[PDB]
Write a structure and sequence with these properties.
The structure is a homotrimer.
Chain A: E1 4-5, E2 8-9, H1 14-21, H2 28-34, E3 38-42, E4 54-58, E5 61-67, E6 73-77, E7 91-92, E8 97-98, E9 105-106, E10 129-130, E11 132-133, E12 138-141, H3 156-159, E13 165-172, H4 176-181, H5 187-191, H6 196-199, H7 207-212, E14 219-225, E15 228-234, E16 236-238, E17 241-250, E18 254-257, E19 265-272, E20 278-285, H8 293-300, H9 329-333, H10 344-354, H11 371-388, E21 406-411, H12 416-423
Antiparallel strand pairs in A: 1-2, 3-12, 4-5, 5-6, 6-10, 7-8, 8-9, 11-12, 13-20, 14-15, 15-17, 16-17, 17-18, 17-21, 18-19, 19-20
Helix pairs in contact in A: 2-11
The structure holds benzene-1,3-dicarboxylic acid (3 copies), FE2/S2 (inorganic) cluster (3 copies) and fe (ii) ion (FE2) (3 copies).
Chain lengths: 435, 435, 435
């Protein structure tokens, strides 16, 4: 798809829309996204060895996640080869999962340890077992061909001490793309999060807010990096200066969000369960120090990008489709909430959810504010279509994801792009740039 | 479809069935029904200016209903042009709805007041905003081409003082047609409402009941009026006389039901939400006087054609799919209810619901009692197929809907058709004809 | 499909999979299974004459079951000919069901007793009424062409005194085939029922258990009988002897399970509601004596093959999709349950359910233990495809179903097949062979 149609940016065509949103096994985006380490499951889920196997579907592939006797977090297919029973009901023990029907056993790597019936027939029963690692507090799995297994991701929050990072998933009933797009559209922070930024503990009392809750019209400068796209979201800061909100889009699914002051750094990744559902991952980290108990609780409590859940055990958020996201029309009128939904993530996924599981890319009237998005789109669309032609994809090299976002006031003189070549090299080993 | 097959009346063919039941945007029935003012939403819903916008889907078009700051009940599409978020979460204020994501604002007429990003790009964002009026206590919207906007409907209950009319909607999980057909089939009143007519306050203690709960075999005389069809439902009244139940079918969806005695006048309209769902509207009015507090409460209480709802806020009736319509097999046996369902509307929609969202027009064995229906069918089918050929449709002129139904005892001598040319001219400005 | 592919048994092809699993009106399996008496409904459901008609869908045919005034359990179609209303809401009285809309009445045989509108038009309204009988405590209906109506089934539990038999249905959310396959795969009894056999009252404290909870690798000998297939499931019993578990598969859907000791005899039949749902029927009978109150309660209580239900009235089991079958991961670890599900049927249908409503016959890696299944498969597939060619099907003659299962210890010398020609003739009129 061309970058600009009729002077306005270009809506996605049919073919393109599906290139991107269809993420099933053996589809364009499917094959592309599989080449990257996939954030499967929190380690806190299978914390115990020989513990409850947990059903996780990633990229339209129903899978099962367990910690082998040895302490190895594994990911196998959920369905036994023998008669397609769920291995959920198998036995996680002796470094494998033995299915409950006729005793067939699966390695973490998904090999058939033991077939009671015909031991000769072990090699036929081999199921889909995919390798894993333990960065982030997240179990990362690799689903792309064995040979093109890349280096585990080295985002700052992957690498920093655990006490420095906080991670949550939230189940969101929409395709990954849209949900991600909300991370790469700072303009929305002006409107839908207008009042919430004052109230929330991760966004509050920072001079940036003044600038945000003012010039909503974000002019975007996109720089293509080998880690994805640098998004310089310009917003009239001071009469002499612009408040650039520099959000790093780490291809293909992780945002590193611009800081809000000294307050903890924030970030996301979007893991598509299928074509209509995604895992919305939020990470807060703090480079210099660890997370205060006060910070941690508040993140735990569902403040910030994190979200309170309906019941323990459920990654479905307390505010959801059913709940009307606790639409408080009082508060709408009382200018305590634009959307009428409180909570940061709730505000965001509510709108994302409302679009439908897949928005009508057809009827999208894209605007300026949508540069980030369009650029990321093409970037994805190229990669996938490219990978179709055997073109190795972008940002596989995890050393390059050694980066941080930024929020600086720059005189309208300084090209921000330049500024980040200068100021933002080795950016993890520097201070953070806030406000 | 021919009027009679094999001597019996004619079942609908495939093509015809869908002409009629498919009501989506840009389908035969869709285009036809759009030419008429559509009863969207009760005014009592958006009673307040700048109040909660209420999600209403009409004719398979998800729409949103609000009262602009000015007091103008509007109907806009539910989805923002920018990224297809629900405007539900927008802001009803300053004579528009400003979507919560990137601040785009919509006029009541559905124009883009303000696009923050690119003010130049306002005219691209124009969404579907459709005109409205305030008859009936119902917000009526016009969805057909701008030019073919007709005169607001002038049914007696539209025009009489509000204190004279009572209006309710009930959410019914079935296509509009069948649901409507129940209004144009007086024969059923004999069987399924047999005992309920004694118990209910709008039908009780009137000599008509004797006649109804006797000769269920209704012979129908249909007269085509320019307002739709006059249905003379003959039923052996007295040995010398017939009890004609004259139900006016006001094309395309409103029944004016024959009176039951001095008791309030009754009526319906069926607004199809989609191909499988409809809004079942019941109106009781009283021409000469206003509705007694005793009448009003009892109508409010869910007696008569009205229906008690599951919870406040919900237009889903208390008796529903789930509830088994409170099947009381005791009462069935105790001859307190034919169907086993109590309540008038409940009795009716239960059966209508049971057919399936769309009945199997294929396997319909139509009978005599089905004249009304078949005639109304063809009338519809012609109009739509006609409108396909650019043939302006029937009953657009709302002066002609200045009519009332009737229930008279006529010697078997008098042709009832004649009787209504004589007796039923200027019928609104007359007495009502009951029993 | 060939019996063996690549030395391993043969997975079902596409065409075959659907031959078997598609059971709708007028499909291969549909037509085949219709030729046999179908266990519709327990008599205990319509125990009363003129009682509540009960909605039952069999073989993808929504039907209605009532006991005519006379005491004749009937099965009619659920939908009225007039306008396709549910006859559920009709009146069971005067040896018929009179539909509630316009008073049309249906015979048990599904003839139109009385059409009020046009009495002439009675013969057009004839609906699907199918004959019935009262064996088992189950209402059996015949749905195949009138002429090919066979003899009511004469399984031992059909014929023995009622106090000798116990019957339950359990609603299982999966196609019939898989669910049935679990009856014809004794190998699973080793693994998934390992610990439950000790605990349960119908399986406990019998020397057979030792043998079962030992050699799970069942070698199968299948003998084709005219009643279906005799399945000699061999399992290393004693060093000198094999524990043959002889399960009779009575074509097309009834297992007679091998005994567990003196304990009551057990059996199943699978009635497909549609392509994705089935009625799982469990029968326990006792040939020599009637069922002890202690046996009966315990069967009633949901022990054995029977199952406790969520609420009274519901044939949905207490442990279900929602409940996670009360996965007790404690118990899994505590070796009180392999699967983690307690209860015999629960253990079984859980796994069956987990496969999906239809398992992925494509990805089935069949093993030795799957002889029974494969043989039964072909047998079915032949019959149906055969019936397609007008080839009258197997096991219609109910005298031949005068048979019982068996569990004998046979020296590894004795061919078990031979043994049953000798020992198992007139087997109903003999002792039972246990352990
Ligand atoms: O793009 C941003 O400015 C921003 C701010 C706060 C949260 C998020 C998010 O992606 O959740 C983005
Ligand atoms: O056609 C009729 O006689 C009748 C009577 C009562 C109610 C209704 C209805 O349309 O709801 C119709
Ligand atoms: O095949 C068997 O051994 C067996 C044992 C217990 C129950 C069942 C069943 O079909 O439910 C089968
Ligand atoms: S289905 Fe897993 S052991 Fe057979
Ligand atoms: S989606 Fe409505 S403001 Fe952008
Ligand atoms: S639908 Fe049954 S009486 Fe008409
Ligand atoms: Fe947001
Ligand atoms: Fe009715
Ligand atoms: Fe079993």
């Amino acid at each position: 798809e061309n970058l600009y149609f009729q002077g306005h940016m270009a809506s996605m065509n049919k073919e393109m829309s599906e290139t991107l949103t269809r993420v099933g096994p053996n589809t364009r985006m499917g094959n592309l996204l599989r080449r990257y380490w996939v954030p499967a499951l929190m380690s806190s889920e299978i914390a115990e060895a020989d513990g409850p196997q947990v059903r996780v579907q990633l990229l339209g592939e129903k899978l099962l996640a367990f910690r082998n006797t040895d302490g190895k977090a594994c990911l196998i297919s959920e369905f036994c080869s023998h008669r397609g029973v769920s291995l959920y009901f198998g036995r996680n023990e002796e470094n494998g999962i033995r299915c409950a029907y006729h005793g067939v056993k699966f390695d973490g790597d998904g090999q058939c340890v033991d077939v009671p019936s015909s031991p000769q027939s072990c090699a036929r029963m081999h199921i889909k077992g995919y390798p894993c690692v333990e960065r982030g507090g997240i179990v990362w799995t690799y689903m792309g061909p064995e040979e093109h297994k890349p280096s585990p991701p080295e985002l700052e929050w992957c690498t920093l001490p655990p006490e420095h990072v906080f991670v949550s998933k939230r189940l969101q009933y929409s395709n990954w793309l849209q949900a991600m797009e909300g991370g790469i559209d700072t303009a929305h922070v002006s409107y839908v999060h207008r009042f919430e930024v004052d109230t929330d503990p991760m966004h509050q009392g920072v001079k940036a807010l003044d600038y945000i809750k003012a010039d909503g019209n974000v002019k975007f400068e996109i720089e293509q990096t080998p880690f994805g796209l640098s998004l310089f979201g310009r917003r009239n800061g001071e009469p002499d200066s612009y408040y650039w909100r520099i959000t790093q889009w780490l291809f293909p699914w992780f945002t590193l969000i611009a800081p809000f002051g000294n307050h903890a750094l924030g970030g996301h990744v979007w893991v598509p369960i299928d074509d209509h559902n995604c895992w919305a991952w939020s990470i807060n980290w703090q480079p210099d120090q660890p997370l205060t108990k006060e910070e941690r609780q508040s993140m735990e409590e569902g403040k910030g990008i994190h979200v309170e859940y309906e019941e323990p055990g459920s990654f479905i958020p307390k505010a959801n489709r059913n709940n009307d996201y606790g639409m408080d029309r009082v508060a709408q009128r009382e200018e305590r909430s634009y959307s009428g939904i409180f909570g940061f993530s709730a505000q965001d996924y509510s709108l994302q959810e409302s679009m439908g599981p897949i928005q009508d890319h057809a009827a999208e009237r894209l605007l300026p504010t949508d540069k980030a998005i369009v650029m990321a789109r093409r970037m994805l669309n190229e990669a996938a279509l490219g990978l179709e032609q055997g073109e190795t994809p972008p940002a596989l090299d995890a050393s390059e994801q050694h980066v941080r976002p930024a929020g600086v006031l720059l005189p309208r003189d300084q090209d921000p792009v330049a500024w980040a070549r200068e100021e933002l090299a080795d950016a993890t080993k520097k201070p953070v740039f806030s406000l």
